[PDB]
Ligand binder design. Structure first.
Ligand SMILES: *Cc1c(COP(=O)(O)O)cnc(C)c1O
Ligand SMILES: *Cc1c(COP(=O)(O)O)cnc(C)c1O
Lengths: 385, 385
């Protein structure tokens, strides 16, 4: 007759969160202004004010992406969810998709592609793709879309994109780019680089809480989407509905799903923040911090996974795991003795490296100092064969 | 040579949000404790502390759902996203899905079902489904899964579920229930009612910000999922990955996607809140407010769309639009002159009704007072043929 479950004891306690300095590939710490944004009251998801904040975020995405694409908006999901929305609306079953698979991300792009109806232009962690090699790929399969990771956060590789725009439009192919870890930390120009679909996450250099993602479509990728004959497998990610709600259409905004309002307040303020600083300074800040961090690490004796500075993702550095060390001890030592988070590999780079992230408000010399003296400490106290 | 887009002027201004009393079908206003949760700093998405908060939320979902299902967790998306995750992992292409389509929600369930590979047991806004009629449906198509809306927020209909558990297990059919608008506001017992998949939203009676959703699978629906031969079209919604991250497996938590950490802090506190109050009181609060509100409205002259109190969703009441009135004026009048939000129809009920929502901390006599004197005012000042 009764209620099977009783109120959980743990919930009857107060929520208590540790203070951790997030210096890994994401999420990153939140500036005071973003936290304040997080604690505001709620407004109607379809109110005139919500739309206004929505338009500002759009102008915000056009600026950080550097595009004028009308089809620009926020995906109410994390990084993956933006990738998936990209693929599920552009790729129609059996389409030939060439994938720059040199990190867990390309790996993820294949999986999604397979699942929805693919050519694994494979590499090894640490490698990138030459303008040369992609023609070779565009050659055989003449795919309708190519996938490239700008900032490969699982390997630390910064991937060059100048020209590819054309090398793809050449073969009547759409260019899809992942700038989840690169946005705000290295130069990127969607239009001038002829990228067709660009997506990014909110919790990396932008310092917004995780859960939302940014996306933009060129008139080219747009036309393919509005004239496919199949309806994309997903309703939650349907750009036709999505675009209309975000005001990208000629029609009145129609109810699709309830946007994550509080997260939008936060994303808006994080876009305001980089708009006040300016992309060029943010680019200079990250480059400088990444340079400082590289110096210190080599001084500690560790060597950089990515041999060649031009190919090093400023926002995420991949150090090679030291000699007779179990990386796990190092990571544990740092979070245990200094309250600092840093990671190990991910996918192909698993156990081969340590990843140190420098993002937005955390990409400072001060934190490079802290993670250096943390790492050094680990190095002298952690077991060693 | 330059940057095409310049920092948006609007973003250079401070974020300013109006104070609105949200009394429509969602989202709802946030108690002080949830807002505080929203403004906390970030922690690692895979830290031991994040997992602890994750387990508490799980215990939290088992309690509000009233189940012990190990396969219980949060979907990093809104209500739809939980429905979609439900359907995309249970239904395999060409499966026969019987859908209680009596509101925009069944409508949504068909669309998703079609998109992924369906029997529209149609009704009219205001109607519900008799234990009788579903056998008739389970009869013809002998579908592997049935979809039922517990709280139809677009029509105001509270749908009875006692027995259906069996009337479905009878025909070897899985029972899928939508308790996005009913959870916390009317009695629901997942196990005792033999529901197989139950999902709810975070922004309705729970008073958490929108963007996350709750889901639970019975051992039955679980087995079908872990032994389908096709991989679900979605990677972001793959329960195999999802379950593992949420600690429902025998394996170490493996990185899938970055959970919306800040939103989880808030959802945890909103679960703590109802755990302190108790489901039975929350059920009593909403029933009582809905009763008070019904009285007042009929006193104002308006009539209730749903004729029969037993079928009236406490959390969302559907009033019929009055005589020579343009509903739009009424809704505008209320948000314009009293800062209060209430809605009109949605889908099948479009323009036929007004929807007044009573949710969680907003389901009070005080707010019933406010929306009554708001509505009355509208009634005397808005145009009338
Ligand atoms: C972190 C990261 C992702 C994943 O974003 P999520 O929000 O965790 O799904 C995707 N791509 C790149 C390059 C990343 O660094
Ligand atoms: C509001 C509502 C939904 C939609 O939830 P979203 O988070 O806006 O996608 C689904 N079902 C019911 C019964 C609802 O009331």
């Amino acid at each position: 007759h009764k209620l099977l479950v009783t109120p959980p004891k743990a919930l009857l306690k107060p929520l208590s969160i540790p203070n951790q300095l997030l210096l890994g590939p994401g999420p990153s710490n939140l500036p005071p202004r973003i936290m304040a944004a997080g604690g505001l009251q709620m407004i109607g998801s379809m109110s005139k004010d919500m739309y206004q904040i929505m338009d500002e975020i759009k102008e915000g995405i056009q600026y950080v992406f550097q595009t004028r694409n009308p089809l620009t908006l926020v995906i109410s999901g994390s990084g993956h969810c933006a990738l998936e929305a990209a693929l599920v609306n552009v790729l129609e079953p059996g389409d030939s998709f060439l994938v720059g698979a040199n990190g867990i991300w390309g790996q993820r792009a294949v999986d999604i592609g397979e699942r929805i109806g693919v050519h694994p232009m494979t590499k090894d962690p640490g490698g990138h793709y030459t303008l040369q090699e992609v023609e070779e790929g565009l050659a055989q399969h003449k795919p309708v879309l190519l996938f490239l990771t700008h900032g490969e956060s699982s390997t630390g590789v910064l991937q060059p994109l100048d020209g590819f725009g054309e090398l793809c439009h050449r073969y009547k192919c759409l260019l899809l780019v992942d700038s989840v870890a690169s946005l705000g930390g290295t130069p990127l120009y969607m239009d001038r680089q002829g990228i067709d679909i660009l997506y990014s996450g909110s919790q990396k250099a932008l310092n917004a809480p995780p859960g939302t993602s940014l996306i933009s479509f060129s008139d080219k990728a747009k036309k393919k989407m509005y004239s496919r004959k199949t309806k994309p497998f997903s309703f939650y990610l349907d750009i036709k509905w999505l675009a209309n709600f975000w005001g990208c259409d000629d029609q009145p905004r129609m109810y699709h799903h309830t946007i994550p309002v509080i997260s939008l307040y936060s994303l808006r303020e994080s876009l305001a923040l980089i708009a006040e600083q300016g992309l060029e300074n943010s680019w200079r800040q990250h480059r400088e911090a990444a340079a400082y961090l590289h110096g210190r690490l080599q001084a500690l004796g560790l060597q950089l996974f990515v041999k060649d500075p031009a190919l090093r993702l400023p926002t995420v550095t991949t150090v090679a795991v030291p000699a007779g060390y179990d990386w796990r001890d190092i990571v544990s030592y740092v979070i245990d003795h200094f309250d600092i988070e840093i990671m190990g590999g991910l996918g192909p780079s698993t156990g081969k490296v340590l990843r140190i992230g420098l993002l937005g408000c955390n990409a400072t010399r001060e934190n490079v100092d802290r993670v250096t003296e943390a790492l050094r400490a680990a190095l002298q106290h952690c077991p060693k064969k």
